[PDB]
């Protein structure tokens, strides 16, 4: 299959290893691609002073489809490990801040994988605003007594306003400024309403506008305006609704619901609650994560659950590993699925969906990695699972079998 | 009657205000005479006093050491129109908490017969919510158009002014905000967290996002680790427990799959969010205690961790039957009275407070409960009217069982 142009972002440690096997055994044997590869490995980002992160983001803007491997965001320990020049910032934040949009996250559900939350019989889709707030903030330590202020200087000559954040009288502490943008919020709202109409489900927006009356009130107002002016009639035609809820009420409503709704989250809440939801369905790694940009055509699919450092340690030590590749697989299929839509590549669309089916049916047939065997029988309880290479070998077979019968 | 002593009462709003009176009339006043210092924190009285009554109540809590608070309305624009308010008043919980300081400890109220929504939580989860700063003392504003937003720090000793660019709005407007926290408050927060873990014999976890907020959240992580290494590590090892810092998103996942049995120190915002998640995970927002424990070790503010339950209130004012779980509000009283008794060595009052808590749990375990807990047993689509009691019917049964239990003692 002539898949077309796709931007690839290589990753780190075990996810890097799986990334290549995904390419060699599941994608390349059936799809020919005009790949634009950017190596976002921790060592290459350091070598390029993180410019490669900036380059890849622009390439996605240029070619409209990116697929990203899990990467390391370095901490103190990692700076020493790789002797890094700086503690480089999260490349996910960099890419999202450049492209903007909404990261849609949803569990990857298998019949035989137990949930931790009893009632979630329908999926929950979180729309995480991908821009601003804590992820582009300016925080600093306050070393001692002093005055912390935040000021806004209008460009049209209107008066500068100054607000007291806090007067530190006896000691120091911490302070920080953050922001968000009307246009970004408007895109976030449009993406949320359109996702609800596509799935035929109600939409909920969570904020804390009772406490952040101006900051979070802006989110509430923009959503309600766009709803009243542009979507209410469409929602009523489909027998769905939109509601704003305070964040603490919303997570409780989600916990007790049956699923089957779209959940628009501010950036920070989307990060936190998407991991809570993913784990609630059975496994934190069984999740899709696709950034949908405002233009409606540009997309970045990713594996969101970081690397598997302990698996990498054994892999290079020669010890057998059993690492779950599903999320990395679904970053590809979701990217290829979008590639097909942009190009009307019906052949690629079938392949993308076929591979997702093969992954689910393979696991639902009892062939799975150690991660899922523990979910079923509990970690304390080799014959129950397949090692990394053995599992991917099986997916290759069922994919070739499934594709042949066509 | 039992001589209860001095207690600061804060009256509330909507459904919790209605329940608040039933608790006093049916469960407290018939058995306890109190020197109550009542402050009406109803939205309309706060507006009339320009929110001064909220500040007065906070200082009264400092004076009498025991406060019990009904849920209140924090108004937004819609609430200003509803009540024709002078201003969009700030959360009185934030005002009280910022004045007194300390840690809000929240935990589910567990009944044998109530199924959970989270499978593994066989041990309790206790959240220690930092009660000071962050979003609850922030300075936010709308950015009407293009312009430059900066945040600056001016030392009081005349040293260099430090200026940071927050963002330059080039096309259109948006929102901006400043936030802060204080070393001493974090230090108190850490001490209260380590001491709670040692008291319960459980490990402690602190959740932050220091990978993104390297300075802001890193300060929390560093202060906790310093105080731990210098003052608590040895005690933790003696009891076979531990302390570790975790990323917030990692932590909520860890908690979801855990079996419980740990202390969870949360920044102010995270404590609010996750306390509702945890309470619902164990079964119901109404089955949770919430007590602000101040640094002095003597002052206390007991509350119900949930809101004023507006949606239930709308039906009540329509004259319709409602079924709102009052246990959390009841336990705000018992927890406050229990602390009042401890400070006063009031063995009779201490017995009463504990007796009512036992009656609350025993009544539910005997099959008498509100609709929320009935749904926990039989999926909400399957609940029938015969499976639960309305709010007043439930309180009547607690009154009867309380009368019985107190007689037999
Ligand atoms: N805090 C203030 O409280 C007001 C309302 O805030 P809100 O967002 O409604 O948060 P609330 O906690 O007041 O309501 C939360 C929701 O959780 C359930 N719930 C909460 N408390 C109880 C209870 N005691 N018994 C049974 N079910 C309960 C209800 O869900 P359902 O509606 O699904 O029953 C309720 O609508 C606002 O003014 C806010 O500022
Ligand atoms: Mg995350
Ligand atoms: Mg709350």
Describe the protein in words.
- The structure is a homodimer.
- Helices cover 45% and strands 22% of the residues of chain A.
- Chain A is an alpha/beta fold.
- The first copy, chain A, has a single domain, classed as Isopropylmalate Dehydrogenase, CATH 3.40.718.10.
- In chain A, helix 3 runs parallel beside helix 5.
- The longest helix of chain A is centred in the last third of the chain and has 19 residues.
- The complex binds NADPH dihydro-nicotinamide-adenine-dinucleotide phosphate (NDP) and magnesium ion (2 copies).
- One magnesium ion binds next to helix 10 of chain A.
- Chain B: One of its GO terms (biological process) is NADP metabolic process.
- Chain B: It is found in: Cytoplasm, Cytosol; Peroxisome.
- Chain B: InterPro entries: IsoCit/isopropylmalate_DH_CS, Isocitrate_DH_NADP, IsoPropMal-DH-like_dom.
- Chain B: Belongs to the isocitrate and isopropylmalate dehydrogenases family.
Per-chain topology:
2 copies of one chain form a homodimer.
Chain A: E1 2-10, H1 13-27, E2 32-39, H2 42-47, H3 51-63, E3 65-68, H4 76-81, H5 91-99, E4 102-107, E5 124-129, E6 138-142, E7 146-154, E8 161-168, E9 173-181, H6 182-199, E10 203-207, H7 215-230, H8 232-237, E11 242-246, H9 247-256, E12 261-265, H10 267-280, E13 287-292, E14 299-302, H11 309-317, H12 326-343, H13 346-364, H14 370-377, H15 388-404
Parallel strand pairs in A: 1-2, 1-3, 3-14, 5-12, 10-11, 10-12
Antiparallel strand pairs in A: 4-5, 4-13, 6-9, 7-8, 13-14
Helix pairs in contact in A: 1-15, 3-5, 6-7, 12-13, 13-15
